[PDB]
Amino acid sequence: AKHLKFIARTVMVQEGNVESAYRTLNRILTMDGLIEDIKHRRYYEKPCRRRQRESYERCRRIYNMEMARKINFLMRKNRADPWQGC
Amino acid sequence: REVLQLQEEVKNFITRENLEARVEAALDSRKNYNWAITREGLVVRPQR
Amino acid sequence: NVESFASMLRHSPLTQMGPAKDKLVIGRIFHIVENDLYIDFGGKFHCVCRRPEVDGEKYQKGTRVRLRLLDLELTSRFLGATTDTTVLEANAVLLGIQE
Amino acid sequence: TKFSIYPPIPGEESSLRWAGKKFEEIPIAHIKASHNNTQIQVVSASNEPLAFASCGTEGFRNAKKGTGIAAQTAGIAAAARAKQKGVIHIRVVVKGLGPGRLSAMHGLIMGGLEVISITDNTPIPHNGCRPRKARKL
Amino acid sequence: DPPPSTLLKDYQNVPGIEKVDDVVKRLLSLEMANKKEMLKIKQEQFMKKIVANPEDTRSLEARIIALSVKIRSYEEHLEKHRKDKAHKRYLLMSIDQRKKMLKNLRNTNYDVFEKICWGLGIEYTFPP
Amino acid sequence: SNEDLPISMENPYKEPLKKCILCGKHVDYKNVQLLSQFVSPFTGCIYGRHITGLCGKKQKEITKAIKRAQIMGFMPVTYKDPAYLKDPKVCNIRYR
Amino acid sequence: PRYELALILKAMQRPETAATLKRTIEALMDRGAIVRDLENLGERALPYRISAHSQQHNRGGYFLVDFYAPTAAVESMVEHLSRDIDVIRGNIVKHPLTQELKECEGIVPVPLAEKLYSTKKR
Amino acid sequence: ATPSLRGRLARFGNPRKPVLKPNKPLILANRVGERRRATCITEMSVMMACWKQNEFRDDACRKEIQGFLDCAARAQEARKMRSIQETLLPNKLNKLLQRFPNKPYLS
RNA sequence: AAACUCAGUUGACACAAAAUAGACUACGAAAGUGGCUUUAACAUAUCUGAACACACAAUAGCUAAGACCCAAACUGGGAUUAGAUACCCCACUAUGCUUAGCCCUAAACCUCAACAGUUAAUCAACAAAACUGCUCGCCAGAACACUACGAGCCACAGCUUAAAACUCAAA
Ligand code: FES
Ligand SMILES: [Mg+2]
Ligand SMILES: [Mg+2]
Ligand SMILES: [Mg+2]
Ligand SMILES: [Mg+2]
Ligand SMILES: [Mg+2]
Ligand SMILES: [Mg+2]
Ligand SMILES: [Mg+2]
Numbered sequence: 001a002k003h004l005k006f007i008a009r010t011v012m013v014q015e016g017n018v019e020s021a022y023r024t025l026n027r028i029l030t031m032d033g034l035i036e037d038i039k040h041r042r043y044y045e046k047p048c049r050r051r052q053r054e055s056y057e058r059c060r061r062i063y064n065m066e067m068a069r070k071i072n073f074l075m076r077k078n079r080a081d082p083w084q085g086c
Numbered sequence: 087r088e089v090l091q092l093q094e095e096v097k098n099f100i101t102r103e104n105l106e107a108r109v110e111a112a113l114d115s116r117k118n119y120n121w122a123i124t125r126e127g128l129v130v131r132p133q134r
Numbered sequence: 135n136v137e138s139f140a141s142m143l144r145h146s147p148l149t150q151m152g153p154a155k156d157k158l159v160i161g162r163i164f165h166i167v168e169n170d171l172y173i174d175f176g177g178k179f180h181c182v183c184r185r186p187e188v189d190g191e192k193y194q195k196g197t198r199v200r201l202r203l204l205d206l207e208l209t210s211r212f213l214g215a216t217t218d219t220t221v222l223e224a225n226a227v228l229l230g231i232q233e
Numbered sequence: 234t235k236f237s238i239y240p241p242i243p244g245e246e247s248s249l250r251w252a253g254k255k256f257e258e259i260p261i262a263h264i265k266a267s268h269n270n271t272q273i274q275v276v277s278a279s280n281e282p283l284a285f286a287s288c289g290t291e292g293f294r295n296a297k298k299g300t301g302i303a304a305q306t307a308g309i310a311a312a313a314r315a316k317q318k319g320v321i322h323i324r325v326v327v328k329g330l331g332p333g334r335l336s337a338m339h340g341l342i343m344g345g346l347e348v349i350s351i352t353d354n355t356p357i358p359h360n361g362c363r364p365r366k367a368r369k370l
Numbered sequence: 371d372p373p374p375s376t377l378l379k380d381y382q383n384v385p386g387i388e389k390v391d392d393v394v395k396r397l398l399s400l401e402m403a404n405k406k407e408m409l410k411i412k413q414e415q416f417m418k419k420i421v422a423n424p425e426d427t428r429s430l431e432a433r434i435i436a437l438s439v440k441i442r443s444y445e446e447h448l449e450k451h452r453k454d455k456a457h458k459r460y461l462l463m464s465i466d467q468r469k470k471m472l473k474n475l476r477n478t479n480y481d482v483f484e485k486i487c488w489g490l491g492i493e494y495t496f497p498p
Numbered sequence: 499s500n501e502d503l504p505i506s507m508e509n510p511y512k513e514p515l516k517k518c519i520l521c522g523k524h525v526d527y528k529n530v531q532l533l534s535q536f537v538s539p540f541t542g543c544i545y546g547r548h549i550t551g552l553c554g555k556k557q558k559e560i561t562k563a564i565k566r567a568q569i570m571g572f573m574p575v576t577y578k579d580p581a582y583l584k585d586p587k588v589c590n591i592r593y594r
Numbered sequence: 595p596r597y598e599l600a601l602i603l604k605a606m607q608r609p610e611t612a613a614t615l616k617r618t619i620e621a622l623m624d625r626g627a628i629v630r631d632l633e634n635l636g637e638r639a640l641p642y643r644i645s646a647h648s649q650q651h652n653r654g655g656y657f658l659v660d661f662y663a664p665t666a667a668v669e670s671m672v673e674h675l676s677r678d679i680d681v682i683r684g685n686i687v688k689h690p691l692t693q694e695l696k697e698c699e700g701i702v703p704v705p706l707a708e709k710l711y712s713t714k715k716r
Numbered sequence: 717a718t719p720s721l722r723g724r725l726a727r728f729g730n731p732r733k734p735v736l737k738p739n740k741p742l743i744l745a746n747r748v749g750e751r752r753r754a755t756c757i758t759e760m761s762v763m764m765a766c767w768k769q770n771e772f773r774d775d776a777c778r779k780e781i782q783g784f785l786d787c788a789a790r791a792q793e794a795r796k797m798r799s800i801q802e803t804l805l806p807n808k809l810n811k812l813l814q815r816f817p818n819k820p821y822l823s
Numbered sequence: 824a825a826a827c828u829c830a831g832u833u834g835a836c837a838c839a840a841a842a843u844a845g846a847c848u849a850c851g852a853a854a855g856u857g858g859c860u861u862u863a864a865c866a867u868a869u870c871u872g873a874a875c876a877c878a879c880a881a882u883a884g885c886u887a888a889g890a891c892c893c894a895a896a897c898u899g900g901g902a903u904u905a906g907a908u909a910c911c912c913c914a915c916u917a918u919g920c921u922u923a924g925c926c927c928u929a930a931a932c933c934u935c936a937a938c939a940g941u942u943a944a945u946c947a948a949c950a951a952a953a954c955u956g957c958u959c960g961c962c963a964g965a966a967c968a969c970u971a972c973g974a975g976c977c978a979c980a981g982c983u984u985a986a987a988a989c990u991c992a993a994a
């Protein structure tokens with residue numbers, strides 16, 4: 001309200017591909033967490049539910065990051081079997 | 087040393103006598119607290 | 135006057151080498167599978183590098199090459215594991231052939 | 234100069250122009266993609282109303298309003314009105330994650346008006362007011 | 371309360387501190403310092419006035435003096451923040467701890483206990 | 499007794515403890531230029547430490563400075579000041 | 595202790611700016627401060643519009659007044675700044691230079707948490 | 717870098733109240749999750765609008781109708797190509813994880 | 824469907840709440856605490872120690888005076904249903920907010936007491952590995968029973984302490 005307009009969350013379309021512009025804007029909002037924040041703020045998430053969801057998301061992120069680390073670590077071992085037959 | 091340095095600084099403290107002069111000097115001057123940081127952690131002072 | 139294990143360990147080239155990070159070692163291709171070159175460089179394990187797109191034919195069993203080591207062994211602990219998972223092979227980058 | 238996704242800054246001397254006009258002078262096409270209705274009002278650089286078009290005003294009623302097709306219809310109508318009222322390029326500012334969010338822009342273009350910038354002005358409170366309670370279905 | 375003109379504990383002994391400007395003296399006085407510095411000055415005053423070794427702090431007398439200064443600070447704080455339950459709890463706990471310290475001091479060294487009681491205005495009331 | 503036996507010492511090969519770019523430098527709520535290096539250009543959101551690459555102490559300093567500047571009128575809240583959009587990028591975020 | 599008063603004044607001419615700064619420093623000295631330094635950060639567009647004393651402001655002059663004042667004078671000075679009509683926004687903070695930069699050797703990492711669960715086969 | 721798990725769960729020797737309350741144990745499984753599962757509506761809209769304003773006489777809507785038909789054929793072709801392309805895969809990744817399983821016990 | 828003729832842009836404008844940071848894990852005895860600034864301020868150089876006292880104790884709730892954006896028990900209307908005293912939609916009050924008192928309860932739970940120590944010869948099961956020393960509190964089949972009676976309390980449909988009879992071979 002008290003800020004200048006058309007600076008925040010504004011993207012400029014390149015060569016007229018408004019679809020690309022909207023994809024870029026959507027990526028920006030998603031990465032900044034605005035889309036998820038709006039979806040969650042539609043209805044009031046009581047503090048206990050909010051805490052449980054935050055804890056669940058933290059555990060999910062820890063597990064996913066560790067599993068991704070394991071996958072990237074073992075990806076090299078997807079080579080062709082060197083000792084085939086024996 | 088702390089008190090010695092404090093005594094030196096007190097000479098420059100604004101007082102009811104040197105108040106208009108210091109106010110006008112401040113109006114004339116410009117202090118810039120901005121400075122960026124690079125990925126290598128090297129300060130980048132602005133050019134004025 | 136018989137060298138002891140302490141003396142041998144102290145004077146061994148591997149011990150003389152510090153950390154194996156960014157150390158240029160001389161490996162020997164001892165097994166090739168498609169474009170995968172298994173190179174032994176005096177460590178406990180071997181490094182499986184990829185036949186460079188240039189001079190690829192020149193890489194054949196017994197060829198002596200230059201590697202830049204990154205880790206003598208590729209191991210790491212993962213969430214919940216009690217002991218490190220090891221892929222039983224070193225990490226190195228193949229810089230070319232030694233002549 | 235090279236294309237930059239950031240909009241030009243007011244007051245800053247810029248060479249960008251659209252129909253001979255600066256960025257700050259382009260008309261603004263405010264879209265509002267509510268949960269079940271998309272509104273589109275095109276105002277001038279001095280907030281002078283030019284056009285309006287909504288899914289409800291386009292004949293759609295009830296659930297039909299909250300669909301991409303209704304949003305496209307509203308966008309096309311608003312684009313036509315703005316075109317006849319003297320608008321070529323527009324800065325689009327949309328506040329709402331309703332189904333008409335992108336379909337409104339698609340219709341607003343298919344109706345002729347070109348878009349130069351897309352702005353998201355969805356009101357995101359830093360908490361403030363308390364929203365309604367959750368739904369158990 | 372010590373006079374506002376009093377110097378801080380760190381500067382009370384710096385040589386030549388009597389030959390510095392009035393501005394410097396006011397900067398180093400308790401006027402331009404928080405209440406912790408004033409409490410420290412009070413504590414040193416009490417130690418000088420009571421204990422036989424003002425330079426020893428691990429002694430039970432020094433502990434009682436420090437805790438009494440803390441209690442005075444809490445009482446002053448609660449005179450104004452009457453609904454500060456946390457500091458009310460700290461005050462009650464500190465009073466209990468001072469009672470325990472006084473009990474031990476009374477059991478060990480009675481003359482020093484009497485000196486502490488007189489100096490700090492503490493009345494050692496036996497528990498019910 | 500035996501000189502070839504290992505000696506008890508530290509690790510002479512220990513690599514330096516990586517330092518955050520701001521280590522040893524004073525984060526001030528008046529250095530809006532520095533503060534804007536850690537806020538999203540589009541929304542003004544303060545980046546997390548997984549993006550800024552800052553220690554915990556410096557991340558907290560940056561956050562407190564940003565909030566103080568925003569509430570004291572030194573920094574915009576909803577966006578990054580356009581004057582600083584062309585400063586050395588130090589945040590591991592790639593929108594495109 | 596050492597306070598720093600960040601003072602955003604209404605965009606005005608030099609005579610009125612000097613008069614306002616003199617008045618503010620006078621108020622500080624009356625309350626009992628030792629004005630150590632005055633610094634002009636330069637007039638600039640405010641990050642957001644500020645509505646002070648029923649008047650919208652888009653530009654303002656930024657100043658810093660580094661002083662030493664007794665702890666009891668800060669509230670009175672804040673009240674005086676609020677009353678003053680040429681000040682868009684005044685804030686007294688503790689001087690950052692008083693705070694010491696604790697030395698940080700480096701970012702010590704946290705190894706993967708170990709022994710969070712029993713080693714029994716499930 | 718993974719978020720720290722030091723002093724996060726409720727355990728003996730953890731004075732602070734738990735930060736996380738994982739319903740399942742935070743131990744990597746030896747398998748990953750399975751791959752979790754309209755088109756060309758704008759051409760359809762163009763064709764249908766032309767029909768609406770022309771009384772559904774395809775003779776003068778030929779261009780839009782041909783566009784719609786070609787786009788539908790392209791949609792089917794895209795479905796086929798996407799299917800064949802989909803056919804690292806979860807199966808192969810699970811084979812790799814089996815080769816290097818997580819050992820949350822001793823041996 | 825009911826409801827409102829109110830809706831969009833712009834500008835002014837809170838005694839309400841406190842995006843991002845926070846992938847941090849800190850502070851506090853616990854309850855709790857995540858907008859900014861300042862002031863005051865985080866007991867105990869030995870540990871344990873209240874049905875035996877003092878001080879606290881989320882939400883809800885009571886009393887009196889204010890605030891009221893939004894949310895919202897109750898109530899009213901729409902809809903669904905065999906019914907719908909619910910779930911779904913709309914309106915709105917107590918209430919959530921401030922002040923001064925009360926009230927003294929939570930799945931008040933990290934269901935894992937305080938202090939000190941160990942990792943060695945494991946360990947019903949599961950859960951958050953197994954123990955040692957010391958101290959206080961508590962427990963001794965289920966249900967009757969967060970009950971009756973007695974007692975205390977600003978509590979008057981309340982809270983704390985808390986049985987017995989009959990019943991069963993289980994829980
Ligand atoms: S890396 Fe040194 S303070 Fe953060
Ligand atoms: Mg005790
Ligand atoms: Mg008790
Ligand atoms: Mg209560
Ligand atoms: Mg009400
Ligand atoms: Mg709780
Ligand atoms: Mg009960
Ligand atoms: Mg009862």
Ligand SMILES: [Mg+2]
């Ligand atoms: Mg009774």
